[PDB]
Structure 1
Amino acid sequence: LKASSLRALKLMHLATSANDDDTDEKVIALCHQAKTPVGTTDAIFIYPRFIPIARKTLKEQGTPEIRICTSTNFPHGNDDIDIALAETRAAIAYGADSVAVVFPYRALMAGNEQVGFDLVKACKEACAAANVLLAVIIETGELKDEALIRKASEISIKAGADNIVTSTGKVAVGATPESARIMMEVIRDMGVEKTVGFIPVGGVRTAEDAQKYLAIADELFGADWADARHYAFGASASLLASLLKALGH
């Protein structure tokens, strides 16, 4: 477990706990937390307008390698591609290393598969031209059905997603061991394990959970697959406190 909690800490994408009431001071506190006694988390997850100050802080503490992830079309997941695209172009210009666009899942739940494909594809073309990763949040907690979770995963992957994410963290249900396994099974069944990673958001509170979720990835792809590029824990500082507590900190 000590080996798992450290492995997980380095895969963490430390997310802000703010709800659009974030502040520069809170983001600076978050940047300092990403610098743990046992090493750095892979990235932080913050709102676009705080990327410049976060980048400044990360360079000031000697951790310029910590990546910055942000969100667009978030958390609503509306089906307006122009707005989602513009927000992605802004996140790119802010300096984001990765942009997590929210899939238009309500449109899928109403029977529209194309809008999600075009939306993801439009944002991927922008992130790719800027050397930025595009993650796609499909919001498993709202899709609920296994078939819809797979469909949204397949569509996102076909549209060029570099990572598929379970949840925004803003709805009733986030990641679960079931939905996480479903999405990773899609990555395997489509043979895209080399180019598509997985990120659970919302359902990983403790070190035991981090070990459980990593066990699924190891089981399905082997223990070597879950590196910084192909796996990450989108979670707040509470999980980091549990991961550190398991390591005696």
Structure 2
Amino acid sequence: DLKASSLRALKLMHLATADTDEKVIALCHQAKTPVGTTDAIYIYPRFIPIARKTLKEQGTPEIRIWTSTNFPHGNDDIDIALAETRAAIAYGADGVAVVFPYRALMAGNEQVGFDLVKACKEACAAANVLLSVIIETGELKDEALIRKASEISIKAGADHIVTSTGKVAVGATPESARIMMEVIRDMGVEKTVGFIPAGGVRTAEDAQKYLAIADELFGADWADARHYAFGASSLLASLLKALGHG
């Protein structure tokens, strides 16, 4: 079970560094692993052009490039999140992860998170770029708030919902992952919305647990690269070790 889960998780990784052009070049090389490529890399927007050229030159132009906007703070200024999203698109992103305005939701504002996600989804869809939304489960903390942010993000057009930025102490848990996937299931949007646990997903055993929740709720074929990803860095070494590499 663990070897199989590990190859599966490797192929679904959005590989991040655990910030310079040299380190991003090294990240691109690391994404071309002995057992296959990760799905993507995840980097700050300014590094997209050099990463694209590196991926092309090593013969893996299929590896996608994700970046983040409104990040990591999840502020509630839509004009700033939209300008950063348009810049990320112009740098060449294949996907943008925008941080949801979670503190505004906690204060009672449901509308601003709908409007901010919808504005960024509009820009991304016009450029054929995917939009994921990071809700910051470790700050929202309560199940009802995690459900509400997931719901609002989906209604506003999120292509994926993501637990965490990796910039606050608490990232994904099995419990917050199950709550967010339950929202996808209950809203019936599993064909159009994926899920990404991120922040603190360190081991092969952690990745197997997240994939086991997806397989239970959606059936084992659901968690393809359009519908699932892992936001992780050092996880790659743990997956490779599980497979007998390094």
Q: Same fold (TM over 0.5)?
A: yes
Whole-Å separation in 2 of the counterparts to 1:213 and 1:162: 19
Offset, 1:241: 0.2
Instruction: Supply the distance in 1 between the matched residues of 2:21 and 2:201 (Cα, whole angstroms).
Output: 26
Look up the match of 1:215: 212
Rounded to whole Å, the distance in 2 between the matches of 1:109 and 1:246 is 40
Q: Distance in 1 between matches of 2:160 and 2:5?
A: 22
Q: Which residue pairs with 1:96 in the alignment?
A: 93
What stretches of structure 2 of length at least 5 have no aligned partner? none
- C-alpha deviations, 1:68-120, integer Å up to 9, x for none? 00000000000000000000000001110000000000000101000000000
Aligned mates of 1:91, 1:203 — CA distance in 2: 25
TM-score scaled by structure 2?
A: 0.98
> How far did 1:203 drift?
3.4
**1:186 CA displacement:** 0.1
How far does the alpha carbon of each residue in 1:101-158 deviate from its partner, in whole angstroms, 9 at most, with x for none? 0000000010100000000000000000000000000000000000000000000000
Corresponding residue number in structure 2 for 1:142 = 139
Three-state SS of the structure 1 residue aligned to 2:224 is coil
Q: CA RMSD in A?
A: 0.5
Task: Measure, in 1, the Cα distance between the counterparts of 2:94 and 2:36.
Answer: 20
Show the counterpart of 1:245.
241
* TM superposition shift of 1:62: 0.3
Deviation at 1:200, TM superposition (A): 0.5
The 3-state SS of whatever aligns with 1:155 is helix
Secondary structure, aligned partner of 2:131: strand
Structure 1: how far apart are the matches of 2:182 and 2:159? Answer: 16
User: Displacement, 1:204?
Assistant: 1.6
Q: Post-superposition shift, 1:172? A: 1.3
**Sequence identity percentage:** 98
**3-state SS of 2:161 partner:** strand
Name stretches of at least 5 consecutive residues in structure 1 with no aligned partner.
17-21
In 2, distance between residues paired with 1:211 and 1:201? Answer: 14
Compute the displacement of 1:240 (Å).
Answer: 0.1
Deviation sequence 1:21-78 (CA, Å, 0-9, x none): x100000000000000000000000000000000000001000000000000000000
CA distance in 2: counterparts of 1:107 and 1:126, whole angstroms: 22
Corresponding residue of 2:196: 199
